[PDB]
Amino acid sequence: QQGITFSKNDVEIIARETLYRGFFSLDLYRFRHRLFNGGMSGEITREIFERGHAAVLLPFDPVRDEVVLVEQIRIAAYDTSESPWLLEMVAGMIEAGETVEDVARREALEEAGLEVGRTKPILSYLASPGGTSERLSILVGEVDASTAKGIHGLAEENEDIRVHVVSREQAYQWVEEGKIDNAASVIALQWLQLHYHNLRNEWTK
Amino acid sequence: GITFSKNDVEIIARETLYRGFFSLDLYRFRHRLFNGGMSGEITREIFERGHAAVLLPFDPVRDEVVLVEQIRIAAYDTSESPWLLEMVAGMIEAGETVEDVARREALEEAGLEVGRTKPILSYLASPGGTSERLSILVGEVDASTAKGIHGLAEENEDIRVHVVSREQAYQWVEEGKIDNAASVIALQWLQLHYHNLRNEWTK
Ligand SMILES: Nc1nc2c(ncn2[C@@H]2O[C@H](COP(=O)(O)OP(=O)(O)O)[C@@H](O)[C@H]2O)c(=O)[nH]1
Ligand SMILES: Nc1nc2c(ncn2[C@@H]2O[C@H](COP(=O)(O)OP(=O)(O)O)[C@@H](O)[C@H]2O)c(=O)[nH]1
Numbered sequence: 001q002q003g004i005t006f007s008k009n010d011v012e013i014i015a016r017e018t019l020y021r022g023f024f025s026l027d028l029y030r031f032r033h034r035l036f037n038g039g040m041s042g043e044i045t046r047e048i049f050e051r052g053h054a055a056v057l058l059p060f061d062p063v064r065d066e067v068v069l070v071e072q073i074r075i076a077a078y079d080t081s082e083s084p085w086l087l088e089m090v091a092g093m094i095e096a097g098e099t100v101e102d103v104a105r106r107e108a109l110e111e112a113g114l115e116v117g118r119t120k121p122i123l124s125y126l127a128s129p130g131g132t133s134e135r136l137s138i139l140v141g142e143v144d145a146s147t148a149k150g151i152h153g154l155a156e157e158n159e160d161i162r163v164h165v166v167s168r169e170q171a172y173q174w175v176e177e178g179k180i181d182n183a184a185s186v187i188a189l190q191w192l193q194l195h196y197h198n199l200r201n202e203w204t205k
Numbered sequence: 206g207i208t209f210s211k212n213d214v215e216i217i218a219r220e221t222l223y224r225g226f227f228s229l230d231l232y233r234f235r236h237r238l239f240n241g242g243m244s245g246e247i248t249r250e251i252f253e254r255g256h257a258a259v260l261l262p263f264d265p266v267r268d269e270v271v272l273v274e275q276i277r278i279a280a281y282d283t284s285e286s287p288w289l290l291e292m293v294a295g296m297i298e299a300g301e302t303v304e305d306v307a308r309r310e311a312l313e314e315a316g317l318e319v320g321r322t323k324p325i326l327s328y329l330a331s332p333g334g335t336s337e338r339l340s341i342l343v344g345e346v347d348a349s350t351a352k353g354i355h356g357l358a359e360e361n362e363d364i365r366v367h368v369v370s371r372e373q374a375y376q377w378v379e380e381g382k383i384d385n386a387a388s389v390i391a392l393q394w395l396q397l398h399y400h401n402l403r404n405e406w407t408k
């Protein structure tokens with residue numbers, strides 16, 4: 001097959017407007033775009049949550065077939081989850097000029113006390129593109145899971161994080177059971193379930 | 206597993222920062238710390254946009270997947286094109302079931318009737334900044350009936366149906382041609398479960 005039909009040349013962003021600015025922003029995009037049946041749409045407005053973009057690191061120990069998870073409260077999970085404390089991947093915001101890999105390695109140390117060896121890209125995804133611009137770029141990072149323990153996170157920033165080490169099999173079973181249910185961890189761990197055999201061979205050579 | 210429960214956090218208040226089609230709320234809360242203490246009062250800005258039902262339309266006889274293409278302007282700044290290849294999906298309104306929304310959107314967005322269904326996974330899109338939860342089902346479809354242009358035109362919805370093989374769709378995930386969370390999650394799940402699913406639905 002061929003894929004998508006239209007490009008950036010087929011949409012005109014007439015205007016953007018920031019409706020709220022605080023730590024994050026809510027922007028109004030005003031645009032018109034080509035229609036599949038020929039013409040151009042009228043003017044359309046969409047509210048878009050703007051919060052920057054993230055680097056995500058799946059810490060995988062290929063010697064032990066183990067993953068390191070970080071636990072912290074995510075209050076937005078409260079209304080639809082039994083607990084707002086989630087088991088997650090290492091992750092942080094990307095600043096201007098920073099690379100995904102530099103952010104991933106720094107956050108692995110800050111959030112889990114982990115040094116990272118080799119890294120490989122997993123996938124880069126849009127979290128929920130009907131309402132937010134956020135893109136997250138996932139790497140897998142080689143770690144020694146026997147070094148992973150304790151409480152981390154930047155305390156001067158109200159970041160309180162607990163490290164957990166589990167087998168890959170257990171982490172994936174938790175995805176299947178819904179005990180791990182945040183997008184970044186689901187995507188990373190499903191990818192690991194599809195790729196771990198080749199990855200362990202590559203990293204223990 | 207996790208350490209703390211809802212007994213360990215108090216939401217003191219929520220403040221509406223923005224109310225429009227969607228909302229942005231400030232949650233004010235305190236919570237237990239791993240070191241044994243209580244936090245001070247924490248605030249977080251949270252994007253409130255309701256919750257979604259997502260349908261992976263899978264034809265188990267033909268081993269085919271139905272994708273829908275539509276513009277998502279929020280993708281513009283970080284993507285080659287704002288037109289994305291996606292799963293059928295829609296907002297869940299008050300009192301509706303995930304499955305009822307999935308079936309209605311499959312008809313509106315792809316002209317598809319759905320047979321049997323099975324849950325895939327329900328996930329938080331980005332819980333550091335939004336409450337949004339999306340519940341994915343796989344739905345049995347006849348992909349030969351999936352074609353053409355759909356979407357509710359009276360709602361600025363312009364949608365093109367694409368049919369690909371399962372292996373083709375997954376290759377597109379690997380290559381970055383499909384790169385939205387709902388589709389990546391659904392198609393990775395399908396790559397892990399298709400053998401048993403095809404057997405269940407053809408025998
Ligand atoms: N005015 C306005 N309407 C929106 C916005 N986002 C979604 N909608 C509405 O959602 C309907 C269909 O769009 P979509 O988001 O794909 O709905 P869904 O498929 O049920 O999730 C249309 O009627 C739009 O009016 C927005 O930012 N502004
Ligand atoms: N006060 C405040 N701080 C925020 C907000 N969003 C992010 N931060 C800060 O950004 C830092 C990293 O964000 P975090 O919550 O850890 O999300 P993550 O980077 O994706 O893991 C934290 O130290 C927070 O203090 C917010 O809405 N309000």
Ligand SMILES: [Mg+2]
Nearest residue numbers: 090091092111
């Ligand atoms: Mg983080």
Ligand SMILES: [Mg+2]
Nearest residue numbers: 091092107111
């Ligand atoms: Mg951090």
Ligand SMILES: [Mg+2]
Nearest residue numbers: 293294295314
């Ligand atoms: Mg939709």
Ligand SMILES: [Mg+2]
Nearest residue numbers: 294295310314
């Ligand atoms: Mg719809």
